[PDB]
């Protein structure tokens, strides 16, 4: 019950999360650039990154090797407020949406309860940490080659600059679709894993390896299914700071339509492969980390 033990666990978790996310930040930046460069003010269509390889080879000489971690501070910080918030809300939402439900005799009522609980805890946390996700994205998208060409010079600068021009709404652009995404993601994750645990994995006796790959596969699939929601989310974040006729999307719905009509249905998955890689590498660093 030691408050000390709890603090130690809390910090250790924050350290682990900070290491894995920092580790895959380069590939995450590529994912973000490909996903949002269409809505960038600095990237002309001619200078757009042609892909992962074209992207990884260009940013070092274009903006400096260190720029691979541009916007990563938000990544190492988010964990703390996020987990602090879960400590006060997470279990309460579970009790609220799942209390009294028999998991075995009421599959769907349980399923829905699970989604509402995850969705409620996620939206609640985001009410506080979303600006961090916002800045992580806007900084990642910034391709300035030096302090003078930087659209934002850092986490604090991004948040303050946007706040001054758009107020709070600017820092929360894309909030709603992100929550929809959280629910779709959770629905796909549990839906797949559920169907999975049935076929091929009897009382999990298989090697740790296959047991890991399977967990990664469920994550990748859940990430793909909800990816479109992530793309309009980030594209909306790119609107903050813009004014008048400069605004590409007037709302989430307008965003969905615009992307579909101006870029094509496949465009919703720009960066999706990079995202799959990012997720895998992230999980691989944690195991690599826990073993040291
Ligand atoms: C120490 C790590 C370091 O070199 O940080 C430099 C970094 C300098 O880069 P910058 O672009 O000038 O910073 C502007 C923004 O602060 C941050 O702007 P940003 O989010 O765009 O930049 C993220 C930045 C920063 O990336 C990190 O800071 C990730 C590393 C984890 C640091 C953990 C700090 C924990 C702070 C504890 C003290 C708090 C007490 C309470 O990434 C890097 O510069 C590369 C890090 C190297 C990774 C290689 C592995 O400074 C910080 O971000 C430190 C914040 C301290 C809190
Ligand atoms: C990452 C890191 O800290 O390396 C920065 C350096 C240089 O990044 P840089 O080229 O952007 O220079 C930063 C220059 N200062 C610090 C003055 C702002 O990366 C390397 O030397 C390449 C080796 C990476 C392998 C890690 C060892
Ligand atoms: C194309 C449109 C798709 C519609 C999906 C709508 C999105 C919402 C997804 C969240 C899942 C909602 C589940 C409904 C839960 C309501 C509880 C209920 O009364 O379910 C009754 C039923 C069964 O709930 P059950 O499985 O808990 O069983 C009740 C227990 N007995 C049978 C003993 C009474 O749920 C459905 O048929 C609706 C599920 C849709 C998925
Ligand atoms: C704790 C979180 C503090 C944080 O995010 O740093 C804010 C600010 C970051 O502001 P920033 O995001 O504008 O970055 C500094 C600006 N350039 C790029 C020119 C270096 O931290 C500091 O500037 C000094 C505090 C160091 C903490 C020890
Ligand atoms: C439209 C979308 C896409 C689909 C939904 C989300 C996540 C995948 C959704 C996700 O992560 C969520 O899903 C997990 C799996 O079901 C769930 O774990 S569980 O409780 O153990 O089941 C996490 O819960 S928490 O308890 O740890 O807090 C939950 O985190 C949140 O609620 C984090 C808030 C900051 C939002 C977190 C996250 C991640 O990459 O994994 C993260 O930022 O770290 C999001 C990335 C952004 C999108 C991508 C959003 O743009
Ligand atoms: C277990 C595998 C199931 C197969 C899943 C196949 C996913 C293909 C990705 C679909 C992307 C998606 O969700 N778009 C929802 C559009 C919703 N609106 C119209 C409101 O914008
Ligand atoms: C197999 C193929 C998997 C790719 C599925 C692509 C999904 C892209 C998507 O959701 N587009 C929604 C367009 C929005 N509206 C309807 C309003 O125009």
Curated annotation (Swiss-Prot):
Gene3D superfamilies in alphabetical order: Mitochondrial carrier domain
Tissue specificity of this protein: Detected in heart muscle (at protein level). Detected in heart.
Spans within the Mitochondrial matrix topological domain: 36-72, 129-176, 230-271
Residues modified to S-nitrosocysteine: 158
GO CC annotation terms, alphabetical: mitochondrial inner membrane; mitochondrial membrane; mitochondrial permeability transition pore complex
GO biological process, one term: mitochondrial ADP transmembrane transport
Activity-regulation annotation: The matrix-open state (m-state) is inhibited by the membrane-permeable bongkrekic acid (BKA). The cytoplasmic-open state (c-state) is inhibited by the membrane-impermeable toxic inhibitor carboxyatractyloside (CATR). Proton transporter activity is inhibited by ADP:ATP antiporter activity.
Residue intervals passing through the bilayer: 6-35, 73-97, 108-128, 177-197, 209-229, 272-289
Residues with the N6-methyllysine modification: 50
Bilayer topology annotation: Multi-pass membrane protein
Residues where N6-succinyllysine is found: 145, 243, 270
Superkingdom as given in the UniProt entry: Eukaryota
Domain topic, free-text comment: The transmembrane helices are not perpendicular to the plane of the membrane, but cross the membrane at an angle. Odd-numbered transmembrane helices exhibit a sharp kink, due to the presence of a conserved proline residue.
Quaternary context: Monomer. Found in a complex with ARL2, ARL2BP and SLC25A4/ANT1. Interacts with ARL2BP. Interacts with TIMM44; leading to inhibit the presequence translocase TIMM23, thereby promoting stabilization of PINK1.
Family as reported in the entry's similarity comment: Belongs to the mitochondrial carrier (TC 2.A.29) family.
Descriptive protein name: ADP/ATP translocase 1
